[PDB]
Design an enzyme around this catalytic site. Sequence first.
Site, mmCIF file in Angstrom:
data_model
loop_
_atom_site.group_PDB
_atom_site.id
_atom_site.type_symbol
_atom_site.label_atom_id
_atom_site.label_comp_id
_atom_site.label_asym_id
_atom_site.label_seq_id
_atom_site.Cartn_x
_atom_site.Cartn_y
_atom_site.Cartn_z
ATOM 1 N N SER A 101 -2.416 -12.820 3.400
ATOM 2 C CA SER A 101 -2.792 -12.803 1.990
ATOM 3 C C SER A 101 -1.637 -13.267 1.103
ATOM 4 C CB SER A 101 -3.286 -11.415 1.560
ATOM 5 O OG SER A 101 -2.235 -10.466 1.559
ATOM 6 N N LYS A 128 0.805 -1.223 0.000
ATOM 7 C CA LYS A 128 0.000 0.000 0.000
ATOM 8 C C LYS A 128 0.836 1.269 0.000
ATOM 9 C CE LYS A 128 -4.007 -1.901 -0.166
ATOM 10 N NZ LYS A 128 -3.592 -3.265 0.266
#
Lengths: 8, 311
Positions: B272, B42
């Site tokens: 993830s 991110k």
Amino acid sequence: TFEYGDGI
Amino acid sequence: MAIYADNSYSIGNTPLVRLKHFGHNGNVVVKIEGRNPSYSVKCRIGANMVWQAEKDGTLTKGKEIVDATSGNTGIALAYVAAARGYKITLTMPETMSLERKRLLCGLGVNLVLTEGAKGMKGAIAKAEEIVASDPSRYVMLKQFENPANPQIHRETTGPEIWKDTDGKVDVVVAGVGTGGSITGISRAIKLDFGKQITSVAVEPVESPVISQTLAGEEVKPGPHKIQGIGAGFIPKNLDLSIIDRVETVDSDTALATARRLMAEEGILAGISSGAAVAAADRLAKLPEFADKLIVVILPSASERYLSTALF
């Protein structure tokens, strides 16, 4: 139990 | 030289590591996006969404950042806000881990906790109230629909994969949250480098809205433990046209794969990251992908999931 949007 | 003016410019240039206990004859290669200013993928969009907003005057001195996020996007915007001198307010349900709450408090962001039962909807609601009370002062970046999200992946993440593999990458595997990663990388490699790779989106089997949509089936999202993906809807920043394949993984297997990454590969990967690897491993053991070099995105790092089922 991440759902509608979270997260992210 | 090589000195960054602030921490936001130091994003990217994440390494490629070849897996030894996954795939077939080292055809699975992972990209460590944990090696970033705030230890997640991110960081690239937290930087670019801010850089872009400045470039078109939506973000100026005095203006204040307000947004809703309960993941690495908040931590990404936080460090950039601090590094570039913006006040920032982040909204999220009071259901968040205290670990991440103190981390954000350490980054100097105004924390606004919405009702737990409300969840994210309540978080987006409050954030949109705040902006509405002063639309001249507040600016919402909106990760799911901001073009700055997948654009930075087209300008950095994608070319990084192309250069490091000398253009020999045949498959890209990535979980989808905002969809910006897979979109930017695919757009980069398929259009800017002109190679017809196989783009594989990974989503929870619990909330497989991409698989359901593409098949024309009834969209039915649901809860899962794979933090970072499975938004429960199709984000605008997910370009379906460049998606060749959609793999689904369950939370339990995704967790296990992440543990295997640590104990066997010596890679501190997030939850993830295990889902993305578990999906690539499946493809990798198909005779059709035996020749193919498969690059997998590992979005975050383990120590961010200390208080989770990962440990």
